[model samples]
Target chain A: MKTFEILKHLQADAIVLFMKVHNFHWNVKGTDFFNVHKATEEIYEGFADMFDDLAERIAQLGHHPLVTLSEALKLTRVKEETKTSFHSKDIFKEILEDYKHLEKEFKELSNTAEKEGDKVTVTYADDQLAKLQKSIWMLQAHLA
Target chain B: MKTFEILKHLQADAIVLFMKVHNFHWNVKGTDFFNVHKATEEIYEGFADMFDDLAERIAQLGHHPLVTLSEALKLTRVKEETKTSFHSKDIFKEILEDYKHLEKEFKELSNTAEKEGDKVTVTYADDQLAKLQKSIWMLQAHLA
Candidate 1:
């Protein structure tokens, strides 16, 4: 069965990622700030909308979503990191690593959904993994 | 081997979609203006950046990119349709359909990349599919 707790965990993960990415977009200061800001906006904003969509999905499947921002913060496995005055390349490196970590979470979520026969959710998780992995590669190669 | 022709086609897809989205964002007339504008910005601007990222990826992959608006119009699968003033729901509906079509293209590209043993390209397509699919579901439910 697709437990509500699992849905909550995944949704919380999405928010943590979304907030962290937006913070990075805002705080990225360097020669590559504009480009990195643009890149991260391209990413997290997409996920910001996705975060809402996932929460809605939780409702659709007969679950009460974690409705508050504090609730989300409490549930997420990702921690808030202090902003760094890092170069764009260094920031990209960190984000690339972050994305890889997110990809790992997605993979695990995919497996969880698969076990529950939540095909649509599993597919969604797999798709996100694909995106994060590709982006990490792109960010890594940019630093190369 | 990925050629200039394939690269142009890929980049063109991003451009045409970007234009379609921007036009819709600008033209929508409805009560959900704020949310719609923000959503449209997320989709269109993300596409704008994706267009550039793909262009950069093309160069990094040693393929020349298609640079002109005219060329993009010709090569892209997405059509620039002129519509009268649309309701917010209808506007989102249009984008949902567009996203579905783009998802198909992304899936095809992923398959092609896999067949060609182009892991990087496959990764890009997969990531795009993930992002688009989430948007698709969100829009669909909104119009429901």
Candidate 2:
């Protein structure tokens, strides 16, 4: 509801998103092994950097950043499922669902920040939401 | 040979390396989700960044960068064999082969760069070779 709360909320989204992408990177299968592998790596690592960026921003806001795996899992609305063998298609299906969920989560978080008088937080959330939406569309189109 | 030729060689090496990392990432299974996922992501994403950097460097060298998935697949030499639910040991065994092949490729490419007197390319190729060696050694030691 407040600025700090909103940042913490969206930070969880990023952690969950990074974890989901890592899962897909590890499980993808097909004839285009190199192409898919490279792309999966691109997005996952890029997000890892983005996670650090978010953490630094939180620290700038005078709040300690969430940095532990357990803390992330506890705060995150996204569920980290059991690690198991998944078909490439199954991984994509789950990823698509996650993108959709994250778009919703980020959008909601943006609005919460805006209402809490944190224009900067709202702006950052808006950009993140847009990025996730675009990434989701790319994955969905790839699956289609 | 010029910068363009050197970049082209690097790009080819990257495509191959990225694919091998993907194979390991996709196939690794066991109680080591944290380590496997983390290592797989680290290597895959590292190559992804290198791939992009090489492509961009190519463009800067007055060569047209290959930017399509089709081109990547066409250029890649990594082979993929499908095996469902590969345990960590099994996956590590298979990956050792791929890593050896990738190392061989990189060595050849580095030779080409050295012959061309391309210091930048030679340095990059050597750096990557060192990193790959470390990873391969770790992977081999981790395997049964």
Candidate 3:
């Protein structure tokens, strides 16, 4: 895949993930209320900022960013969370799966960037992978 | 000042402000709870991602990111909020002032980057300034 195409996938994933976490942030309940609420906010917020980075980086590499909500939905592997009544653990569990999926995707993007001689992109993907790993650890800890 | 040094200061400001906003996100209350809470989360989350970008950019330019809380405090104009109790407006007001201050700082950083021929850093600063300005507008709207 072209680097721009890889970035668009990442960008679309960010957009969908941002809304998913925001949904969880607003709906999570139970003993995990405080932790889950805060954590979801943090996750969504990171995704919100990542949207800009991915888009701008794509622009820097001489491609246009995917600009529509439909484009985001069409391009992302992360599914939109439509239900607002999920249990805290269920929500966390769902997010954990998404994070793992994204981590795998980021690894692919990293290898591609390295192969393409795009050091900046490789660095970005590497950093994202580290973050996803840490997030997974924390989410798993919460479940355990 | 060197672009690296400017980035360090910006990085420090981001760190301190991220914590401040995170605190606000957790503790905000009253009729405006939902908006303030969500907004604070969004602000802090953006800062969290910006921290990585700033640090990595600094590294890319051959410098170390500030490595300690004290170092960040000494370098940043944004102050830590030690008190956990405050009116929603009070918190918003404090944050508004901080955003304006950071906006000014970012403008200076943009100029410095331009002068130093660091187009990437200039683009980064300009983006940050736009985000800060939008944040300022929202906070002011909330207060009004």
Candidate 4:
């Protein structure tokens, strides 16, 4: 697949995760409230940044537009939130799945970006990987 | 002084820390590359998310424009990076300082949010504090 296509998938994945994380923030309750709520905010906020930066990088490679929320769902592998709320453990578990999905996407993106000799996008993917890794660790840490 | 004022300061601190954290990522070298690189990535990626969320929350409270990077510089209490590269330990130490700085800002933000009965922003600040606490612990653990 092309770097352009991979970037689009990344953009799409980012948008979906943004909403998913916010859903967790808005719904989590009790002792996990602060941990989940705040953690979700950081995660979604990173998603927002991820998507924004992807758009800019995508434009530099080849200009494009964000199609629609529904369209992003079509492009993404990560599942979207359907329910109003979840038990904190469930929320953590679901987001971990989503993050793992993204971890693959970034790895693919990095591979494709490297093939093109685009050091910048490779760096971008690597950075996203680091963020995702830390997030994954924290989420799993809480579950244990 | 006000929720509005605290938000601007948060915005400013976020912008400054964004640069500061990125500085660490860019300059870090040697065996610590993966861990240091990855950790800084999570930190700044989170910062990017932090400022954008703060902006939207600020708009919800009162509409305002992002003035300038220079303006953010002036408004921030979090110091900017002055050196190119640092030993991993030094980088860790310095960032611990920055994390503590934002820790205070979020605490203040939560206090003001509490006063205004803005449960949403209060929730926002508390979550940030959790993230900060986690980071603080990790950094100290590494230092030890």
Winning model by lDDT: 3
**What TM-score, to 2 decimals, does candidate 4 have?**
0.52
Q: Taking the tens digit of each residue's C-alpha lDDT, what string does model 4 give over A58-125?
A: 76685452443434656886665556546988878888888888888889999989998999989988
Model 3 CA lDDT for position A30:
88
lDDT of model 4 at residue A26? 58
Which ten-residue region of model 3 chain B has the weakest summed lDDT? B62-71
Q: What is the lDDT of residue A59 in candidate 2?
A: 87
Tens digits of per-residue lDDT for model 2 on B13-45? 567667766777876776765666666778778
Fraction of reference contacts reproduced per prediction? 0.00, 0.00, 0.00, 0.00
Residue-level lDDT of model 2, residues A1-144, one tens digit each, is 666765665577677778777876765554333345567688778667767767876887789889687888788877776674556566667767877876786687778777767787778878887888888988888898
Give the Cα lDDT of each candidate.
0.75, 0.70, 0.78, 0.76
| Runs off by more than 4 Å, candidate 1 | A1-144, B1-7
Q: Best TM-score goes to which candidate?
A: 1
Per-residue lDDT tens digits of candidate 3, residues A30-91? 88789887888788778877876787688679665664444566788776555757788888
Q: Model 4: which docking level applies?
A: incorrect
**Backbone collision count in every prediction?**
1, 1, 0, 1
Give the best candidate by DockQ.
1
Which candidate do you rate higher for lDDT, 1 or 2? 1
List the candidate 3 regions with Cα displacement exceeding 4 Å.
B1-144
Candidate 2 chain A worst ten-residue window by lDDT: A28-37
> Would you give me the overall lDDT of model 3?
0.78
The predicted structure with the larger lDDT, 2 or 3, is: 3
Please state the error at residue B47 of candidate 1 in Å.
Answer: 1.2
How do all the candidates rank in terms of lDDT, highest first?
3, 4, 1, 2
